Amino acid sequence: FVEMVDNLRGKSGQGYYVEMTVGSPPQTLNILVDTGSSNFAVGAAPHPFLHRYYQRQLSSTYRDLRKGVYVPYTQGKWEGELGTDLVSIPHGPNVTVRANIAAITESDKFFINGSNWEGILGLAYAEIARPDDSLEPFFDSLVKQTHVPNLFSLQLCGASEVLASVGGSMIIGGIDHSLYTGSLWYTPIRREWYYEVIIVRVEINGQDLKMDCKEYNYDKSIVDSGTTNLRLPKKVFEAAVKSIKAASSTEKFPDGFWLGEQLVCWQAGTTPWNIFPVISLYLMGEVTNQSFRITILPQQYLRPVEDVATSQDDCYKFAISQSSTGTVMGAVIMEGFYVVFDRARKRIGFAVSACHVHDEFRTAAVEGPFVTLDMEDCGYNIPQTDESRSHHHH
Numbered sequence: 302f303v304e305m306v307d308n309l310r311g312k313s314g315q316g317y318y319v320e321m322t323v324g325s326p327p328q329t330l331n332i333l334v335d336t337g338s339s340n341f342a343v344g345a346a347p348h349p350f351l352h353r354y355y356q357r358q359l360s361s362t363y364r365d366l367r368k369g370v371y372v373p374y375t376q377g378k379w380e381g382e383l384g385t386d387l388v389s390i391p392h393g394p395n396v397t398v399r400a401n402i403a404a405i406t407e408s409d410k411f412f413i414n415g416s417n418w419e420g421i422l423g424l425a426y427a428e429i430a431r432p433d434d435s436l437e438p439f440f441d442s443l444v445k446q447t448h449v450p451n452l453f454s455l456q457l458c459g460a461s462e463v464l465a466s467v468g469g470s471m472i473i474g475g476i477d478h479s480l481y482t483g484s485l486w487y488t489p490i491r492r493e494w495y496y497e498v499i500i501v502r503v504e505i506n507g508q509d510l511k512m513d514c515k516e517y518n519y520d521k522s523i524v525d526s527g528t529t530n531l532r533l534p535k536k537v538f539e540a541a542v543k544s545i546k547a548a549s550s551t552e553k554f555p556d557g558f559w560l561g562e563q564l565v566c567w568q569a570g571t572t573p574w575n576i577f578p579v580i581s582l583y584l585m586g587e588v589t590n591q592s593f594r595i596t597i598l599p600q601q602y603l604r605p606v607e608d609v610a611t612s613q614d615d616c617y618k619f620a621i622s623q624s625s626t627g628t629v630m631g632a633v634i635m636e637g638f639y640v641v642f643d644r645a646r647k648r649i650g651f652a653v654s655a656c657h658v659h660d661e662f663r664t665a666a667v668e669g670p671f672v673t674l675d676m677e678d679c680g681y682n683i684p685q686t687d688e689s690r691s692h693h694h695h
């Protein structure tokens with residue numbers, strides 16, 4: 302799959318994007334690769350953060366669906382007009398698909414100044430598409446219209462006046478064995494909406510957090526390429542930070558640091574990595590009572606940021622943060638690993654990435670199996686609203 306290697310780029314903390322074309326003749330746009338959502342949406346009008354945008358009127362193959370769409374996130378929001386057009390991924394499979402496209406006509410706190418992307422490719426499932434689940438997602442249309450296998454894989458890699466450039470690979474339709482070492486371990490997709498998974502155990506430097514495992518997945522756990530941080534439920538975040546602070550206590554950081562609101566620095570090349578612990582997330586295995594662990598380094602959860610001031614220092618941001626909407630395994634987790642979104646088999650694979658950042662004493666790892674007798678249920682059941690209950694599903 303050599304032509305798809307190195308098909309992702311971006312700026313550290315601002316998203317990985319892939320080049321796509323939309324329309325006839327093809328307009329090129331940089332599109333955020335987001336496994337935490339299910340819409341293909343592109344800037345379609347002027348915005349102070351956009352260099353360029355989709356112009357429906359210049360496309361001979363555009364069809365208007367004469368329907369609007371609205372997507373608020375917590376942080377972030379956009380709206381636009383629905384239609385279809387021809388879409389291709391130049392550094393992807395050699396095919397062209399007719400897909401749904403949301404033409405973003407207005408937004409708030411969505412586009413990111415300097416990120417160099419103009420749209421989003423939601424790679425998750427129809428259930429969480431807007432306005433509803435009859436708007437077929439891009440990947441679904443790709444699979445139905447072409448012979449491309451129902452799987453994609455992501456290798457996200459490497460992280461004074463500008464942020465650092467990052468690179469990665471999105472392999473559509475298969476697995477490229479040059480992008481990983483060792484074994485590939487699979488965790489079930491719990492339900493096809495988000496890429497929901499189940500964490501059964503958490504350790505910080507070998508030490509079990511010893512919480513009821515349902516807390517790890519309160520109110521869900523998901524794999525999301527479009528989120529920078531590892532985000533943890535409030536209770537878990539608190540326990541995690543208490544344990545990391547204890548490991549690192551030779552260094553008394555400001556509160557702002559642990560809130561992700563302040564950098565901490567050392568003289569170039571002198572960062573004391575070994576005072577920061579590894580974090581191990583045990584994921585449910587394909588077999589009853591089995592699990593496997595993925596282990597990340599401080600090199601993953603301390604994000605490097607270059608101080609225009611003291612550019613003579615190596616400075617870092619803490620990239621683990623509190624959530625009220627469940628665990629998010631964001632780019633912090635994914636930069637450790639080659640991650641296989643095996644939709645055909647309702648599972649997510651992890652292996653050690655051939656490009657992850659480490660040192661001479663520790664590595665990110667994927668290891669198993671681990672076995673538990675009479676393993677309880679670690680999944681949470683989100684309270685059912687009357688609104689959601691009333692939906693029909695024909």
Ligand SMILES: COC(=O)[C@H]1C[C@]2(CN1)C(=O)Nc1ccccc12
Nearest residue numbers: 335337338374376377411525527528
């Ligand atoms: C629940 O939707 C998700 O998790 C998606 C969408 C996402 C990150 N991943 C988000 O939340 N805001 C936002 C803003 C810009 C780009 C991507 C996103």
Ligand SMILES: [Zn+2]
Nearest residue numbers: 692693694695
């Ligand atoms: Zn009905």
